[PDB]
Amino acid sequence: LNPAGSGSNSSAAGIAASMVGSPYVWGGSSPAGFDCSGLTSYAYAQAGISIPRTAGGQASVGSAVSYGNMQPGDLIVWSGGAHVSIYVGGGQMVHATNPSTGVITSSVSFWSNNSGQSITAIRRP
Amino acid sequence: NLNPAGSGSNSSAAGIAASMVGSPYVWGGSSPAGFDCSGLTSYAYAQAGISIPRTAGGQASVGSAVSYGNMQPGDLIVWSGGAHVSIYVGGGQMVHATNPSTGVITSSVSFWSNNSGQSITAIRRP
């Protein structure tokens, strides 16, 4: 599964990457502070595409992507909505973690192997 | 009129441009396949939802005037009346399509002002 990618996908990835270092804040969806679905929602809204506010809702939009076909901008939903990240290439994802670390870039593999969470959806708006 | 409040489009254009670092430079280019200097700034803003002039010279008139000390990520820096254009990304750095040998890079605004022979003729906030 390698559905059609667009400028909005690569642009959402670039906006998310530029937000690295932003604070984590419960319910946040702006540069003042993001939660996990608020960062992905914000990145796509700024690229001109509205996606649902919750990780669970983000799991149903766009086209299904297979793991090996991930491209920058793909939304990775974890354990049915427990978490959401945005793929930025090189096996890395950008995501709002917790108040101690804020918005970071880290390994998809490390999170899948050690967080206790599993990828339940990979979507390409 | 002068140094007006920035928007998400400004910070978003800066993020999109920074993500294009490593892209090839190509004469007349305005896509990830290859960019010229004004093609990169136009593309970054189009992806952030704003249409700006295609040429560096036209970008000198877009949006509002900005003074050097008030630059914020997303500000367009026009050089020698359109000879070059770059986008400020903060920390004194700008992203720009240089030439085929280096492609799109991030480099110092002060290094370019002091040694390129070019001068800032306009700083604009779309």
Domain containing residue A15: CATH number: 3.90.1720.10
> How far away is chain B from the Cα of A50, in angstroms, using its nearest Cα?
13
Report whether B87 contacts B35 (CB < 8 A).
no
**Residue in the structure block whose two tokens are 């649902």:** A52
Angle, helix B8-19 to helix B37-47, in steps of 10 degrees: 130
Q: Which two three-digit tokens encode residue A36?
A: 């996990």
Is B79 part of any domain? Answer: yes
Report which DSSP code applies to B25: B
End-to-end CA, chain A: 14
Strand partners, A103: A96
The technique by which this structure was obtained is: X-ray
Helix (H) or strand (E) holding B11: helix B8-19
Listed in sequence order, the DSSP H helices in chain A are 7-18, 36-46, 55-58, 108-114
> How far away is chain A from the Cα of B78, in angstroms, using its nearest Cα?
23
Cα B4 to chain centroid distance, Å, stands at 18
Interface test with B, best of A8, A9, A10, A11 (most B CBs within 10 A): A11
Is A1 part of any domain? Answer: no
* E strands, A11-124, in order: 29-30, 33-34, 63-64, 75-78, 83-89, 92-96, 103-107, 119-124
Instruction: Round to whole Å and give the CA distance between A86 and A45.
Output: 14
Give me the domain span that covers residue A105. Answer: 7-124
The answer to whether the CB atoms of A14 and B9 lie below 8 A apart is no
**Residue in the structure block whose two tokens are 């892209």:** B23
Report whether A103 contacts A20 (CB < 8 A).
yes
Is B114 part of any domain? Answer: yes
Instruction: Round to whole Å and give the CA distance between B109 and B92.
Output: 6
- Residues whose CB falls within 8 Å of the CB of residue A90, separated by 6 or more in sequence, listed in order: none
Interface test with B, best of A6, A9, A15 (most B CBs within 10 A): A15
Listed resolution, Å? 1.9
- Between CA A97 and CA A102, with CA A100 as vertex, the angle to 5 degrees is 45
Report whether A87 contacts A71 (CB < 8 A).
yes
Is B28 part of any domain? Answer: yes
Is B3 part of any domain? Answer: no
Instruction: Round to whole Å and give the CA distance between B85 and B62.
Output: 13
Is A2 part of any domain? Answer: no
Domain count of chain B? 1
Is A104 part of any domain? Answer: yes
Instruction: Round to whole Å and give the CA distance between B126 and B28.
Output: 22
- Chain B residues bordering chain A (beta-carbon distance below 8 Å): 8-9, 11-12, 14-20, 32, 46-49, 73
Instruction: Round to whole Å and give the CA distance between B42 and B35.
Output: 10
- The 3-state DSSP class for residue B65 equals strand
Q: Compute how many other C-beta atoms are within 10 angstroms of the C-beta atom of residue B106.
A: 15
- The 3-state DSSP class for residue B123 equals strand
